[PDB]
Amino acid sequence: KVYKDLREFLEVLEQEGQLIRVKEEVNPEPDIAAAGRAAANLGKNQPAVFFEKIKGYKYSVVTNVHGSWQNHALMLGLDKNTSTKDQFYELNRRWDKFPVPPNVVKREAAPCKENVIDKDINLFEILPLYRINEQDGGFYISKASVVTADPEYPDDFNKLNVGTYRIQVKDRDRVGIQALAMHDIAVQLEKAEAENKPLPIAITIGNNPLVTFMASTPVGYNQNEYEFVGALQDGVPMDIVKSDLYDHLYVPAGSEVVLEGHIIPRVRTVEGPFGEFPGSYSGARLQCEVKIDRITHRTNPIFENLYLGIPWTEIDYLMALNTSVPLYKQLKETMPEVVAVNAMYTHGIGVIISTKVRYGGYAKGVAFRLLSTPHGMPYSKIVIVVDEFVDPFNLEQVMWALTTRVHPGKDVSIIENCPGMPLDPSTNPPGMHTKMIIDATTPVPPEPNPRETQLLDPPDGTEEWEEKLKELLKN
Amino acid sequence: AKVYKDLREFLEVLEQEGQLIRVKEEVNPEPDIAAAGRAAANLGKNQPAVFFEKIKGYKYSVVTNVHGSWQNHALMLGLDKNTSTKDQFYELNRRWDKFPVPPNVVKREAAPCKENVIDKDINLFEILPLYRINEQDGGFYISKASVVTADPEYPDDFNKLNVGTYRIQVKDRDRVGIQALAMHDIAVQLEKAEAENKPLPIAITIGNNPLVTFMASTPVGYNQNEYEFVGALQDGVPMDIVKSDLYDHLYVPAGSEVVLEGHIIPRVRTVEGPFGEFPGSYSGARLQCEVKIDRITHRTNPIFENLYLGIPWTEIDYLMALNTSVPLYKQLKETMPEVVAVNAMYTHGIGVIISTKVRYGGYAKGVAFRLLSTPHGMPYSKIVIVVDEFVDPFNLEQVMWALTTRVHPGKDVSIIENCPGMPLDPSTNPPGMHTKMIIDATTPVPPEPNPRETQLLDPPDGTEEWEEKLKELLKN
Amino acid sequence: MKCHRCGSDNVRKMVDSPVGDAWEVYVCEKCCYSWRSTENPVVMEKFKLDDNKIANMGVIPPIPPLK
Ligand SMILES: [Cl-]
Ligand SMILES: [Mg+2]
Ligand SMILES: [Mg+2]
Ligand code: NA
Ligand code: NA
Ligand code: NA
Ligand code: NA
Ligand code: NA
Ligand code: NA
Ligand SMILES: [Zn+2]
Numbered sequence A: 001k002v003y004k005d006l007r008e009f010l011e012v013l014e015q016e017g018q019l020i021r022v023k024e025e026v027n028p029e030p031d032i033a034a035a036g037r038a039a040a041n042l043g044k045n046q047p048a049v050f051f052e053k054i055k056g057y058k059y060s061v062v063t064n065v066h067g068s069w070q071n072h073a074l075m076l077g078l079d080k081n082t083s084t085k086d087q088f089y090e091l092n093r094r095w096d097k098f099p100v101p102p103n104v105v106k107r108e109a110a111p112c113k114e115n116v117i118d119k120d121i122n123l124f125e126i127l128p129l130y131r132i133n134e135q136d137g138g139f140y141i142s143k144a145s146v147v148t149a150d151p152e153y154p155d156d157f158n159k160l161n162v163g164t165y166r167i168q169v170k171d172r173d174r175v176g177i178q179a180l181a182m183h184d185i186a187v188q189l190e191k192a193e194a195e196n197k198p199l200p201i202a203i204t205i206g207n208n209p210l211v212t213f214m215a216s217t218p219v220g221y222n223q224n225e226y227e228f229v230g231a232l233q234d235g236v237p238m239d240i241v242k243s244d245l246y247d248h249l250y251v252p253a254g255s256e257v258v259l260e261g262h263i264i265p266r267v268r269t270v271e272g273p274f275g276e277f278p279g280s281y282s283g284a285r286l287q288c289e290v291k292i293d294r295i296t297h298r299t300n301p302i303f304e305n306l307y308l309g310i311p312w313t314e315i316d317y318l319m320a321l322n323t324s325v326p327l328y329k330q331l332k333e334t335m336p337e338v339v340a341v342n343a344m345y346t347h348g349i350g351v352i353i354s355t356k357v358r359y360g361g362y363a364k365g366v367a368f369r370l371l372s373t374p375h376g377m378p379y380s381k382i383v384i385v386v387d388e389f390v391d392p393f394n395l396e397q398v399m400w401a402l403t404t405r406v407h408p409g410k411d412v413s414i415i416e417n418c419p420g421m422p423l424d425p426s427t428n429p430p431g432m433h434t435k436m437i438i439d440a441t442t443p444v445p446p447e448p449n450p451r452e453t454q455l456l457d458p459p460d461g462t463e464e465w466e467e468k469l470k471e472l473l474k475n
Numbered sequence B: 001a002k003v004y005k006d007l008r009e010f011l012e013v014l015e016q017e018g019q020l021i022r023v024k025e026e027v028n029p030e031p032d033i034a035a036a037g038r039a040a041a042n043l044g045k046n047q048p049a050v051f052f053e054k055i056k057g058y059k060y061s062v063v064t065n066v067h068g069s070w071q072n073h074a075l076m077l078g079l080d081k082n083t084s085t086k087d088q089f090y091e092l093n094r095r096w097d098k099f100p101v102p103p104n105v106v107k108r109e110a111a112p113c114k115e116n117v118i119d120k121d122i123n124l125f126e127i128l129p130l131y132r133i134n135e136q137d138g139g140f141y142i143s144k145a146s147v148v149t150a151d152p153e154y155p156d157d158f159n160k161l162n163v164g165t166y167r168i169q170v171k172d173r174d175r176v177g178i179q180a181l182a183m184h185d186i187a188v189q190l191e192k193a194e195a196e197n198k199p200l201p202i203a204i205t206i207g208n209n210p211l212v213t214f215m216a217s218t219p220v221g222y223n224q225n226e227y228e229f230v231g232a233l234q235d236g237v238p239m240d241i242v243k244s245d246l247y248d249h250l251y252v253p254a255g256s257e258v259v260l261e262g263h264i265i266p267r268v269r270t271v272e273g274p275f276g277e278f279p280g281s282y283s284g285a286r287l288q289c290e291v292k293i294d295r296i297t298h299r300t301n302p303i304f305e306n307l308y309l310g311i312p313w314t315e316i317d318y319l320m321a322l323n324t325s326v327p328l329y330k331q332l333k334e335t336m337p338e339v340v341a342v343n344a345m346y347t348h349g350i351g352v353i354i355s356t357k358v359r360y361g362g363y364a365k366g367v368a369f370r371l372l373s374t375p376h377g378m379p380y381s382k383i384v385i386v387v388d389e390f391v392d393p394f395n396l397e398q399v400m401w402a403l404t405t406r407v408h409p410g411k412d413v414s415i416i417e418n419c420p421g422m423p424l425d426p427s428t429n430p431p432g433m434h435t436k437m438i439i440d441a442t443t444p445v446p447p448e449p450n451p452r453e454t455q456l457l458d459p460p461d462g463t464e465e466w467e468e469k470l471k472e473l474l475k476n
Numbered sequence C: 001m002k003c004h005r006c007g008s009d010n011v012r013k014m015v016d017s018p019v020g021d022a023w024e025v026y027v028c029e030k031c032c033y034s035w036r037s038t039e040n041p042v043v044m045e046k047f048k049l050d051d052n053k054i055a056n057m058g059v060i061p062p063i064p065p066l067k
Helices: A006-015 A031-041 A069-075 A084-097 A184-193 A209-215 A225-232 A314-334 A362-370 A395-405 A462-473 B007-016 B029-042 B070-076 B085-098 B185-194 B210-216 B226-233 B315-335 B363-371 B396-406 B463-474 C051-055
Strands: A019-026 A048-054 A060-063 A115-117 A145-148 A161-164 A167-169 A174-177 A199-205 A239-242 A250-252 A257-263 A269-271 A285-297 A302-304 A338-345 A350-355 A382-386 A412-419 A432-440 B020-027 B049-055 B061-063 B116-118 B146-149 B162-165 B168-170 B175-178 B200-206 B240-243 B251-253 B258-264 B270-272 B286-298 B303-305 B339-346 B351-356 B383-387 B413-420 B433-441 C012-016 C024-027 C034-036
Touching: A006 A019, A006 A048, A006 A069, A006 A302, A019 A031, A031 A048, A031 A060, A031 A314, A069 A084, A069 A209, A069 A314, A084 A225, A084 A314, A145 A184, A145 A209, A145 A250, A161 A184, A161 A209, A161 A225, A184 A199, A199 A250, A209 A225, A209 A314, A314 A338, A314 A362, A350 A362, A362 A382, A362 A432, A362 B363, A362 B413, A382 A395, A395 A432, A412 B363, A412 B413, B007 B020, B007 B049, B007 B070, B007 B303, B020 B029, B029 B049, B029 B315, B070 B085, B070 B210, B070 B315, B085 B226, B085 B315, B146 B185, B146 B210, B146 B251, B162 B185, B162 B210, B162 B226, B175 B200, B185 B200, B200 B251, B210 B226, B210 B315, B315 B339, B315 B363, B351 B363, B363 B383, B363 B433, B383 B396, B396 B433
Parallel strands: A019 A048, A060 A302, A350 A382, A382 A432, B020 B049, B061 B303, B351 B383, B383 B433
Antiparallel strands: A048 A060, A115 A285, A145 A161, A145 A199, A167 A174, A174 A285, A199 A257, A239 A250, A257 A285, A269 A285, A338 A350, A412 A432, B049 B061, B116 B286, B146 B162, B146 B200, B168 B175, B175 B286, B200 B258, B240 B251, B258 B286, B270 B286, B339 B351, B413 B433, C012 C024, C024 C034
């Protein structure tokens, strides 16, 4: 099942019983947030909730689109009950089709160009903006795919990057974007601000769930996320169209809303505070401002926003696999011994790696590679490495590897003054944290090991005795 | 410019440039071939290759200091004999980017290495003037040798065919011992073979194109074929290879002086060493693999390209100077474009100095992490120093400045226990495993706090013009 | 004739000089030590070997399990 717009995916979600409609009119302030928190609180099979009527606004909103493993599987076109490891292996396969050039279409063929706003600009006319958490500094746009191009190489389609950044609405036509220093957009912004020139930007809302997926994926700078979408669609290229005001800028053809504008250079204003994925408010800082120059949107647009907060909200499901897969691939390219990578916990700040130990101390080398990767160098604070046969996704086994294979005299390594992530509320020098590497692997030569650590082979008949017991129980 | 197809063409150029001398007198092999090699490198600069025409017991000849000088190193690349070090580093940096240059397979009749075949009673001493390199060495050794092995799991994948350099102790007329170090590519293929108790086919080549010997010692990735790199360093001219006689999947240079086709005996180790190595000390004897020579092919009047090694800056140190830094620089730059240059000339990369721009706070430690997760640097690099973009990592004077003014040992020095090591390092107490040390000699960048002032001074206004006015006034 | 490194008598001739009667080469076969008949070797006490040292010598590289 391949989707060209958000509406096709929503239709599938409803056919599978993973979408519920709030037909009654509802206040935007305390309710859209509460419904988002409640939806994730359901535990399992969490559906997306679709608001048909909002007190002050004309159009509708959708929350918790990605907020469950059921929705995550339908995103990949798989059975709604496909398991976690099944989806992880399906992503591992489609990933290897990487370069799948997108399909450029004429402007008339793009639904996102149905309506254009050029006169007095007002986001509230078209977007039912609401406040996400009580102490948030304002109305936010959480789930949004932002398109920027490298000023130095504006023609290189590879250096065109699309990612997700939180956006605070500050006026009818200006918003604030969190251009974190470690993300791709900051590389392009520095090049522009070094010449006091604005950076063209396109903010898309309500996209193909795969587009939203790749936006939040920590792929390399020289890799275009649209080409990954074609790979995740199993070779079916996705449709993009050129932005009205800026060439070199391409947006999905089926977007609900496109905000074309520019980042005002060398200017910072009061952004935040904002409740983030660690379950805590992130303090207010001076962050960039964006001026909205033009709006294109589909008729009757739908606002795809998300709630985030105390963990395992919608965002934690979105980031569960799109963070683990590229880290596994990035590691696997240099080190074929790596088995799997688990980075689902708090956006990869904790990573568990399963690997064969080629030679003594190889576990530390694997950790070093993870800490020198685009997403793990600034994000990963605690890196646990386990053997080939340990499932890094089975915390029970990881706890066994910790208790039986970790000698804190040698296996625990703590490194000061390494790149950090400011959103982690533990960093004492904010944006800068001390890394901890835990080698829960069995020692391999030339590392000396006087003890016996080899695992027990199961008794002889265990295979057959499993069947004989199951049969005896059927009485 | 000048591209060489055999070792003999290169030797001719070395002699035309006054970088090769002939020892016409007969000289017995034991104390002399080693002494001449040490003396050649001891000459300091413009060190020539020495060619021995007559050896007391043997029929053929040997040449020792082929790579043992910057002059020979420059002529190897087809550059002017006096081309500077930084000029050669930039020339390698350029040609490297032509990487996939498919080699040219030639007919067997066209390969000089196939001129002679030995199948009956096999004797290395008949064709190779074997000699002892250092006094306490365990036996006669073959230091400079390009060894070709193929992946047992994927024997048809030409990329997984790897050629590298390993020291070889001659243990009998038809058996030798190879040092299959655990961190090198050959050990990956050997494990696959020994996990099934199957031998590993191998081809030991001697006396090759100096670029082939160069790529053999270069720590490129496993899935990268070294013959394809030779074509790149020849500026697009593919090199000539021929299929091995006994083993397909195995390709050797067409112009090799000697080719030894055989197999590594699986799950067997014997007493190899001791052997004087590049750190200037004897490496202790250990139990290492043996290979059985099944057949020998060689050119008429073969030449034995061996080298002397010992107290550092022998021939081997010149060979490893640039072929270690270039792939490390390229490997880092692929992930982190902020890296400027990498210096790994010292003790075969056990000490590495990296120059880089610091994108954000602590980025220097991340660069060090990448260097410590690279094929070569993970087991080899013990001391990793990172300096700013504007420091020349090859200028130890500046590196000494960065250490004294940018290193706060409270935070900038990080020591990590129980990390992969290299056994030839005589300092590793758990041998083959050393504690890493990272030194961040870069200027702090946000969000790393810095209460002090560390920005560099802009030179006074007229400094540019005053340099000329002073130089002009001096011309009196 | 004994071996200069381990003192075993299980030593044999490995090869003759290809040209004339210049020299011969001998091999230990208990510790693999080879030497030429011309050079009179004197192994340093640091590098000598007995059956005990060869036993606990340490291998490079390790032998994998068999499957
Ligand atoms: Cl001060
Ligand atoms: Mg990106
Ligand atoms: Mg290799
Ligand atoms: Na990109
Ligand atoms: Na992205
Ligand atoms: Na351990
Ligand atoms: Na190599
Ligand atoms: Na290779
Ligand atoms: Na520093
Ligand atoms: Zn002996």
